[PDB]
Design a protein around this ligand. Structure first.
Ligand SMILES: CC[C@H](C)[C@H](N)C(=O)O
Ligand SMILES: [Mg+2]
Ligand SMILES: [Mg+2]
Ligand SMILES: [Mg+2]
Ligand SMILES: [Mg+2]
Ligand SMILES: [Mg+2]
Ligand SMILES: [Mg+2]
Ligand SMILES: [Mg+2]
Ligand SMILES: [Mg+2]
Ligand SMILES: [Mg+2]
Ligand SMILES: [Mg+2]
Ligand SMILES: [Mg+2]
Ligand SMILES: [Mg+2]
Ligand SMILES: [Mg+2]
Ligand SMILES: [Mg+2]
Ligand SMILES: [Mg+2]
Ligand SMILES: [Mg+2]
Ligand SMILES: [Mg+2]
Ligand SMILES: [Mg+2]
Ligand SMILES: [Mg+2]
Ligand SMILES: [Mg+2]
Ligand SMILES: [Mg+2]
Ligand SMILES: [Mg+2]
Ligand SMILES: [Mg+2]
Ligand SMILES: [Mg+2]
Ligand SMILES: [Mg+2]
Ligand SMILES: [Mg+2]
Ligand SMILES: [Mg+2]
Ligand SMILES: [Mg+2]
Ligand SMILES: [Mg+2]
Ligand SMILES: [Mg+2]
Ligand SMILES: [Mg+2]
Ligand SMILES: [Mg+2]
Ligand SMILES: [Mg+2]
Ligand SMILES: [Mg+2]
Ligand SMILES: [Mg+2]
Ligand SMILES: [Mg+2]
Ligand SMILES: [Mg+2]
Ligand SMILES: [Mg+2]
Ligand SMILES: [Mg+2]
Ligand SMILES: [Mg+2]
Ligand SMILES: [Mg+2]
Ligand SMILES: [Mg+2]
Ligand SMILES: [Mg+2]
Ligand SMILES: [Mg+2]
Ligand SMILES: [Mg+2]
Ligand SMILES: [Mg+2]
Ligand SMILES: [Mg+2]
Ligand SMILES: [Mg+2]
Ligand SMILES: [Mg+2]
Ligand SMILES: [Mg+2]
Ligand SMILES: [Mg+2]
Ligand SMILES: [Mg+2]
Ligand SMILES: [Mg+2]
Ligand SMILES: [Mg+2]
Ligand SMILES: [Mg+2]
Ligand SMILES: [Mg+2]
Ligand SMILES: [Mg+2]
Ligand SMILES: [Mg+2]
Ligand SMILES: [Mg+2]
Ligand SMILES: [Mg+2]
Ligand SMILES: [Mg+2]
Ligand SMILES: [Mg+2]
Ligand SMILES: [Mg+2]
Ligand SMILES: [Mg+2]
Ligand SMILES: [Mg+2]
Ligand SMILES: [Mg+2]
Ligand SMILES: [Mg+2]
Ligand SMILES: [Mg+2]
Ligand SMILES: [Mg+2]
Ligand SMILES: [Mg+2]
Ligand SMILES: [Mg+2]
Ligand SMILES: [Mg+2]
Ligand SMILES: [Mg+2]
Ligand SMILES: [Mg+2]
Ligand SMILES: [Mg+2]
Ligand SMILES: [Mg+2]
Ligand SMILES: [Mg+2]
Ligand SMILES: [Mg+2]
Ligand SMILES: [Mg+2]
Ligand SMILES: [Mg+2]
Ligand SMILES: [Mg+2]
Ligand SMILES: [Mg+2]
Ligand SMILES: [Mg+2]
Ligand SMILES: [Mg+2]
Ligand SMILES: [Mg+2]
Ligand SMILES: [Mg+2]
Ligand SMILES: [Mg+2]
Ligand SMILES: [Mg+2]
Ligand SMILES: [Mg+2]
Ligand SMILES: [Mg+2]
Ligand SMILES: [Mg+2]
Ligand SMILES: [Mg+2]
Ligand SMILES: [Mg+2]
Ligand SMILES: [Mg+2]
Ligand SMILES: [Mg+2]
Ligand SMILES: [Mg+2]
Ligand SMILES: [Mg+2]
Ligand SMILES: [Mg+2]
Ligand SMILES: [Mg+2]
Ligand SMILES: [Mg+2]
Ligand SMILES: [Mg+2]
Ligand SMILES: [Mg+2]
Ligand SMILES: [Mg+2]
Ligand SMILES: [Mg+2]
Ligand SMILES: [Mg+2]
Ligand SMILES: [Mg+2]
Ligand SMILES: [Mg+2]
Ligand SMILES: [Mg+2]
Ligand SMILES: [Mg+2]
Ligand SMILES: [Mg+2]
Ligand SMILES: [Mg+2]
Ligand SMILES: [Mg+2]
Ligand SMILES: [Mg+2]
Ligand SMILES: [Mg+2]
Ligand SMILES: [Mg+2]
Ligand SMILES: [Mg+2]
Ligand SMILES: [Mg+2]
Ligand SMILES: [Mg+2]
Ligand SMILES: [Mg+2]
Ligand SMILES: [Mg+2]
Ligand SMILES: [Mg+2]
Ligand SMILES: [Mg+2]
Ligand SMILES: [Mg+2]
Ligand SMILES: [Mg+2]
Lengths: 51, 96, 64, 76
RNA sequence: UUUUGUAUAAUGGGUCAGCGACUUAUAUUCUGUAGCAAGGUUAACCGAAUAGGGGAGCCGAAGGGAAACCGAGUCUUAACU
RNA sequence: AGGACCGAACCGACUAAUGUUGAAAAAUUAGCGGAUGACUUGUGGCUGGGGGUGAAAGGCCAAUCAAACCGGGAGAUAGCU
RNA sequence: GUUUAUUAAAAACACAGCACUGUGCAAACACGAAAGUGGACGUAUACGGUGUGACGCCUGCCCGGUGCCGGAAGGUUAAUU
RNA sequence: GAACUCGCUGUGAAGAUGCAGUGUACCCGCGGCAAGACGGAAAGACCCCGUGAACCUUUACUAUAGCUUGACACUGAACAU
RNA sequence: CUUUAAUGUUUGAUGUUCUAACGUUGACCCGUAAUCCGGGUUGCGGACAGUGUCUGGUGGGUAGUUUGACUGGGGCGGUCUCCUCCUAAAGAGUAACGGAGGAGCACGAAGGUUGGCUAAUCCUGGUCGGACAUCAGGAGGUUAGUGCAAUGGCAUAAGCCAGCUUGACUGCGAGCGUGACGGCGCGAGCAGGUGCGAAAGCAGGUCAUAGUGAUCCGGUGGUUCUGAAUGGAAGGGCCAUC
């Protein structure tokens, strides 16, 4: 649909990421969430990037 | 493999893996084949003259499969922990 | 003469220790964002060939 | 015409009846909405499926002030 | 003969005699039978030898993993009740 | 004088009847068109098959033509009888 | 005048005449891997292609679409480097 | 296919010499007529089907002879812009 | 660094002239007894024309092929995957070009947790204000509401408000349901690390059921794998994703 795919790149430098969708017209704020990084086995901040 | 036009089984499933060239120059040896050599010195060249392994083989391993009675010497070959315990109990030795 | 192996079948099946065959699951190449993580976790290991398909596989692999 | 299409059947309904011996984790009934509610040793899934949390015998009873139906497990 | 179904007004044959259609080769799996058995068996070739020699090779006696690798266990996972 | 007129030999083929296991694998009988011309005829020669030739009908090329005849690939292929 | 030899001879084909268009001669065009040959031992009052069809009175409006002819300031663009 | 080869009404792969019920009928030729034997002569040309053919058309797809553009080779020397 | 005239450099191009490659189906001589051919003298053109390799455009002139199925005969028309109800005969399943409607999404809150709350409609009174706005009281009891069709559910609310939050979490999984198969679905519990609550506890997306595409091939990031004499590398495998 009009929603588009993005990815959440971990800030720990391990290289792990998640994927999800977004619509960039009504929400232009970058997404930030705390998720579980399995390489370091911790909860850290993830940030938006491009597929 | 034909099924009337439906996509056959060997074509709707994914491929995997690769082929190892080092697996064709490796063999395994049994404890029962360990007393068929000449001289009691178990070596790569002694196993080929006994028709135990192939001429192209470069690596070999001894596994716990069978029985060993005589004392023999293993020189230059890999041995499991299970086979090493049985070789020693028969009065042999492993020298790398 | 000698039978010829179906060379695209040998790339997908492997014979196990009692005469069975293992293969790789489908639906894990492509379009992965919309699938749930529970579904994708269960498709990662290898499975065995069913009874209905054993006759078709064995014909394709005469020297297996 | 402008009719012509339907959908697949979903195979709902009761799978285990009264007095049956089941193992923990087996499915008692499949339903849309809670036409039966969960009682003792019985859980409810996200699609309103009822399953056994222990092993015993299936049981049906009517309870409460609204005369609703429940399913329980009588352990051995 | 073909069909749901033929005395059918559905097909075929005027009659007699002669001929006329599931084979051969090489691979693979199962059953019966014979030999030998943790072993079984030789190909080309030599030999006047249906004898004898030839063990190059092949199948079986160990499996798991994509592979390195480990091995009565191995893979999966930071690790498995 | 004339791709002029009537009409035999000569070249055609408009109508009817017969024949249609024919006298004939296209004829006979009674009538019919042209008949000094873009006419008709003997002997020899040249054009070869996806090619030739055609005052043009998909016409003709040895009783065979919306792709001649003979030999080969060849026991082509036939989910059909 | 010609035509479907063997079910169609006609209103179909050809025709004398009319118009458009190509060709300066080692012509355009056609048969040919090529060499060669026809056009023609001809030379724009000649040769090839296309349409209409003796003769009399005539042949009106449309270049937007498709095809063809002429132009090159600008944009895009191959091998090559 | 073989026959010792009648009419009617019913039945029946649904239009009967051969089935059921019933009526009529001594055996065998010869000259004639065509109502029936779903009469004889061509594995229907109409219709549909086969992941069957052939030829024809085009702004269907993929190619290609021919034609056309440029770079390099055969291919050199001066001069001025 | 701005624009400038110029020594000289590498050239690229556009014209003129030349002759010596090349052309001559112009004239003459010889082989010769010859309108072919070859050699010679002379005139006319001339680095053009023409030919080989490569390359963009045009090209039914030629060639090889394709142009679906269902269907109360074929064509025209309509349909082809998924969700809900009836037919469907009180377990599941059940056909027709039978009878009625929807889907090819949305949402970092419309997800998680803790605390709280209860509808439509009608009557009476009241400034603008009226059949219908905001306020007050009474009757009524879900006749309301679910992000979107229909059905089954929903008060302990799954419906309506707030505070704090990222469990829309990583590795597995006893045992079940449904498929010819590929596959699809439900799930307590275990290990690591989190949010809400004083706790007991709850959370692996949303009341549930539609919102979808196998394999091949190629791209992006990461890797205790492999690496054709050896050390690297190219390429391949495994994990995540397009
Ligand atoms: C080489 C890729 C090929 C074309 C593949 N079948 C796709 O499609
Ligand atoms: Mg298909
Ligand atoms: Mg050997
Ligand atoms: Mg992948
Ligand atoms: Mg082998
Ligand atoms: Mg239907
Ligand atoms: Mg149904
Ligand atoms: Mg009960
Ligand atoms: Mg027959
Ligand atoms: Mg029938
Ligand atoms: Mg009968
Ligand atoms: Mg009969
Ligand atoms: Mg009949
Ligand atoms: Mg009869
Ligand atoms: Mg019949
Ligand atoms: Mg029939
Ligand atoms: Mg018939
Ligand atoms: Mg018959
Ligand atoms: Mg007959
Ligand atoms: Mg006979
Ligand atoms: Mg046979
Ligand atoms: Mg056979
Ligand atoms: Mg058998
Ligand atoms: Mg042998
Ligand atoms: Mg032998
Ligand atoms: Mg042999
Ligand atoms: Mg021999
Ligand atoms: Mg030899
Ligand atoms: Mg020898
Ligand atoms: Mg041997
Ligand atoms: Mg030997
Ligand atoms: Mg061998
Ligand atoms: Mg373990
Ligand atoms: Mg005359
Ligand atoms: Mg006359
Ligand atoms: Mg005639
Ligand atoms: Mg007659
Ligand atoms: Mg006559
Ligand atoms: Mg006459
Ligand atoms: Mg005349
Ligand atoms: Mg006359
Ligand atoms: Mg003659
Ligand atoms: Mg000829
Ligand atoms: Mg031909
Ligand atoms: Mg040919
Ligand atoms: Mg015609
Ligand atoms: Mg003829
Ligand atoms: Mg022809
Ligand atoms: Mg042909
Ligand atoms: Mg032939
Ligand atoms: Mg052949
Ligand atoms: Mg045949
Ligand atoms: Mg003639
Ligand atoms: Mg004639
Ligand atoms: Mg005729
Ligand atoms: Mg007329
Ligand atoms: Mg004509
Ligand atoms: Mg002119
Ligand atoms: Mg000439
Ligand atoms: Mg000439
Ligand atoms: Mg001439
Ligand atoms: Mg002409
Ligand atoms: Mg005309
Ligand atoms: Mg005229
Ligand atoms: Mg006139
Ligand atoms: Mg006129
Ligand atoms: Mg006009
Ligand atoms: Mg125009
Ligand atoms: Mg132009
Ligand atoms: Mg009789
Ligand atoms: Mg008789
Ligand atoms: Mg009689
Ligand atoms: Mg009778
Ligand atoms: Mg009768
Ligand atoms: Mg009757
Ligand atoms: Mg009878
Ligand atoms: Mg009778
Ligand atoms: Mg009877
Ligand atoms: Mg009778
Ligand atoms: Mg009787
Ligand atoms: Mg008589
Ligand atoms: Mg008689
Ligand atoms: Mg008579
Ligand atoms: Mg008759
Ligand atoms: Mg009869
Ligand atoms: Mg007949
Ligand atoms: Mg016929
Ligand atoms: Mg047909
Ligand atoms: Mg078909
Ligand atoms: Mg040069
Ligand atoms: Mg000249
Ligand atoms: Mg000449
Ligand atoms: Mg000059
Ligand atoms: Mg010059
Ligand atoms: Mg040139
Ligand atoms: Mg064409
Ligand atoms: Mg064509
Ligand atoms: Mg073909
Ligand atoms: Mg059809
Ligand atoms: Mg119809
Ligand atoms: Mg009908
Ligand atoms: Mg019908
Ligand atoms: Mg029907
Ligand atoms: Mg039908
Ligand atoms: Mg049709
Ligand atoms: Mg139709
Ligand atoms: Mg249609
Ligand atoms: Mg039912
Ligand atoms: Mg029922
Ligand atoms: Mg029911
Ligand atoms: Mg049934
Ligand atoms: Mg049915
Ligand atoms: Mg609450
Ligand atoms: Mg509802
Ligand atoms: Mg909805
Ligand atoms: Mg709700
Ligand atoms: Mg909520
Ligand atoms: Mg706390
Ligand atoms: Mg949802
Ligand atoms: Mg909600
Ligand atoms: Mg919903
Ligand atoms: Mg749904
Ligand atoms: Mg349902
Ligand atoms: Mg190397
Ligand atoms: Mg690499």
């Amino acid at each position: 649909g009009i929603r588009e795919k993005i990815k959440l790149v971990s800030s720990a430098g391990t290289g792990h990421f998640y994927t999800t969708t977004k619509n960039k017209r009504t929400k232009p704020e970058k997404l930030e969430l705390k998720k579980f990084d399995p390489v370091v086995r911790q909860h850290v901040i993830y940030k938006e990037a491009k597929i | 493999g034909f099924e009337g036009g439906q996509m056959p089984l060997y074509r709707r499933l994914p491929k995997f893996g690769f082929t190892s060239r080092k697996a064709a120059i490796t063999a395994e040896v049994r404890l029962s084949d360990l007393a068929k050599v000449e001289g009691g010195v178990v070596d790569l060249n002694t196993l080929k003259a006994a028709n135990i392994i192939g001429i192209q083989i470069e690596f070999a391993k001894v596994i716990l499969a069978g029985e060993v009675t005589t004392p023999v010497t293993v020189r230059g070959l890999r041995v499991t922990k299970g086979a090493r315990a049985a070789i020693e109990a028969a009065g042999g030795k492993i020298e790398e | 003469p000698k039978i010829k192996t179906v060379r695209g079948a040998a790339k997908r099946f492997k014979k196990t220790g009692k005469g069975g065959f293992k293969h790789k699951h489908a639906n894990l190449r492509h379009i992965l964002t919309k699938k749930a993580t529970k579904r994708k976790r269960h498709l990662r290991p290898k499975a065995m060939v069913s009874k209905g398909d054993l006759g078709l596989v064995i014909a394709c692999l005469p020297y297996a | 015409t402008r009719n012509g299409r339907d959908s697949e059947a979903k195979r709902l309904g009761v799978k285990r009846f009264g007095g049956e011996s089941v193992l923990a984790g087996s499915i008692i009934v499949r339903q849309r909405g809670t036409k039966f509610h969960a009682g003792a040793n019985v859980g409810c899934g996200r699609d309103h499926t009822l399953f056994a949390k222990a092993d015993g015998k299936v049981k049906f009873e009517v309870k409460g002030p609204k005369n609703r139906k429940f399913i329980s497990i009588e352990a051995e």
